[PDB]
Design a protein around this ligand. Structure first.
Ligand code: 9TP
Length: 581
């Protein structure tokens, strides 16, 4: 190996990348420490890295990256008064002292809300001091998203710096800042959600589940590449995502850069869509590789019948190698079905292996798998019909009405869940159809099923901290690929005792008449959640009508005077109406 691995990482990543990655790692481990302490720690670490790269014979950096980072970290966090039950695990040492910070990551911290100052003062402070401003941006974005993907974060910071340096020195200021930065924040939220999905899969269902997922995704993405190249790529990026998800940020970025270099070195052996990615810089190179379009469908592809169902030695070949055989099957199937969802391909592979384990090593083997591909017809027909009906229900209802419909549906399904997480999950579930119902019936399903799984994993992780619904936990821990089939097959919870009537939850105030559109919509959806929880047995049309009445008075008397009079009168009237249904 390479002695003084901190020096090796510093040499490979560079100076500024090393500093930014160390800042990201520190901010993700400590989500409550102030920015100045993180800057001081990062500066000390990078001076140590400079000293050790200057002379490898240093007597201190013979230690590993994890113990070095912990030593520089938990001495500041050695006080168990401000961070709560956080300094306890600094007492122990490697390797449990890494779990110290791994298990203490807070997905939903109660950090103070951002103010978002005006554009002019914002980028004049940017011009006043850029490095501190960008470090503050990285620290703030890493605080609220402890499971962010670090090289993606570096790319986002680079794009943010480029936007600031490019489009506020011009004539107008906000015209470029607001829409561009809104697009970047939406991209950041989406990337954080995807990386949280990957990290949760790796940390819960094992490395094999993520390896199978990545094999399916890459085979769907690189149909031309042979199985050896796909296996090498999935091993490399599985190591990468394990390293980021385990807190090994520096080596994770290093390995992602190496993977991008390999991929654009061997494009011709992998895919033809990569010819336009690595001409970009390293960060943009990796981003393009991670988001490259699917390659063209190869011709003369067999139907999988002669090799996987008709072959008489299929169960034997499974017997010698189970993991390799299932990887080959999943790779071939994902090659032949790019329109199929990745988790759908995982479900199909699981069904195939369950059938093979069930019978081929019992009685006549051939008298099962000759018809095993007939078992996949309902497995693919269910998601197609589900997303078809969801997109149809979305097309004439629109954004907000679709949000309301999904919200009342999921509140009926699992009323025990807390209101804010339920509202957020419903909002994202409406954004599903908002983003990929416009595609034809050849690319709707990837968006649909994949980002449905992303949002459902967000629900599962938000529910893990305060487990209150038995079914939600039961089928969030059950399987990673069957989350959406569970949350679709769940029926109305009969055992749920209706929530006690509280008039406060159905009464609005002056603030909603002057909030933004998003905040007013969220408050209205929260009121809908409370109403459905109060009367879970009501029908869909009744809730639709009462929500129509809610919007009716909200847009009736938010523009007139005597606000309190309207609030009181309308609240009492609609409370009486809802009580009388
Ligand atoms: C654009 O990138 C993203 C930003 C964000 C949010 C976010 C959301 C915004 C915004 C700015 C910011 C940023 O805050 C900016 O960063 C500066 C950080 O440094 C401080 C200062 C340093 C020295 C003086 S001020 O000022 C800050 C700026 O005001 C602010 O625009 C990020 C800082 O960390 C975050 O979480 C923040 O204006 C409109 O809505 C979320 C993203 O996805 C989840 C994302 O992709």
């Amino acid at each position: 190996a390479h002695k003084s691995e901190v020096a090796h990482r510093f040499k490979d990543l560079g100076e500024e990348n090393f500093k930014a990655l160390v800042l990201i790692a520190f901010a993700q481990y400590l989500q409550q420490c102030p920015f100045e302490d993180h800057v001081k720690l990062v500066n000390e670490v990078t001076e140590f890295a400079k000293t050790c790269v200057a002379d490898e014979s240093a007597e201190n950096c013979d230690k590993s990256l994890h113990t070095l980072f912990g030593d520089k970290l938990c001495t500041v966090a050695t006080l168990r008064e401000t961070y709560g039950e956080m300094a306890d695990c600094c007492a122990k040492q490697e390797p449990e002292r890494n779990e110290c910070f791994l298990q203490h990551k807070d997905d939903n911290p109660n950090l103070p809300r951002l103010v978002r100052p005006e554009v002019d003062v914002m980028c004049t402070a940017f011009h006043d001091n850029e490095e501190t401003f960008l470090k503050k941006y990285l620290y703030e974005i890493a605080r609220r998203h402890p499971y962010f993907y670090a090289p993606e974060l570096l790319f986002f910071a680079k794009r943010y710096k480029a936007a600031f340096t490019e489009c506020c020195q011009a004539a107008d200021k906000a015209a470029c800042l607001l829409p561009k930065l809104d697009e970047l924040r939406d991209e950041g939220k989406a990337s954080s959600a995807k990386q949280r999905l990957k990290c949760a899969s790796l940390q819960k269902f094992g490395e094999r589940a993520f390896k199978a997922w990545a094999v399916a995704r890459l085979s769907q993405r690189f149909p031309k590449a042979e199985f050896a190249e796909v296996s090498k790529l999935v091993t490399d990026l599985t190591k990468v995502h394990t390293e980021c998800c385990h807190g090994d940020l520096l080596e994770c970025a290093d390995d992602r850069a190496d993977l991008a270099k390999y991929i654009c070195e061997n494009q011709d052996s992998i895919s033809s869509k990569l010819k336009e990615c690595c001409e970009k810089p390293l960060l943009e190179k990796s981003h393009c590789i991670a988001e490259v379009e699917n390659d063209e469908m190869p011709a003369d592809l067999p139907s999988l019948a002669a090799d996987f169902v008709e072959s008489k030695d299929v169960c034997k070949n499974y017997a010698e190698a189970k993991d390799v055989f299932l990887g080959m099957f999943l790779y071939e199937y994902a090659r032949r079905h790019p329109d199929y969802s990745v988790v759908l391909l995982l479900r199909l592979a699981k069904t195939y292996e369950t059938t093979l384990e069930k019978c081929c090593a019992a009685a006549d083997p051939h008298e099962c798998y000759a018809k095993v591909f007939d078992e996949f017809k309902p497995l693919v027909e269910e998601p197609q019909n589900l997303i078809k009906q969801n997109c149809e229900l979305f097309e004439q209802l629109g954004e907000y009405k679709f949000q309301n419909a999904l919200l009342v549906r999921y509140t009926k399904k699992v009323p025990q869940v807390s209101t804010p997480t339920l509202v957020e999950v419903s909002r994202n579930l409406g954004k599903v159809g908002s983003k990929c119902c416009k595609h034809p019936e050849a690319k709707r399903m990837p968006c649909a099923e994949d980002y449905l799984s992303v949002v459902l994993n967000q629900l599962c992780v938000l529910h893990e901290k305060t487990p209150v619904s038995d079914r939600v936990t039961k089928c969030c821990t059950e399987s990673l690929v069957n989350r959406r089939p569970c949350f679709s097959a769940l029926e109305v919870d009969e055992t749920y005792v209706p929530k006690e009537f509280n008039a406060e939850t159905f009464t609005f105030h002056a603030d909603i008449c002057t909030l933004s559109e998003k905040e007013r919509q969220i408050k209205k959806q929260t009121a809908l959640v409370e109403l459905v929880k109060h009367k879970p047995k009501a029908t869909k049309e009744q809730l639709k009508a009462v929500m129509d009445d809610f919007a009716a008075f909200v847009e009736k008397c938010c523009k007139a005077d005597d606000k309190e009079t309207c609030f009181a009168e309308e609240g009492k009237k609609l409370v009486a109406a809802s009580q009388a249904a």
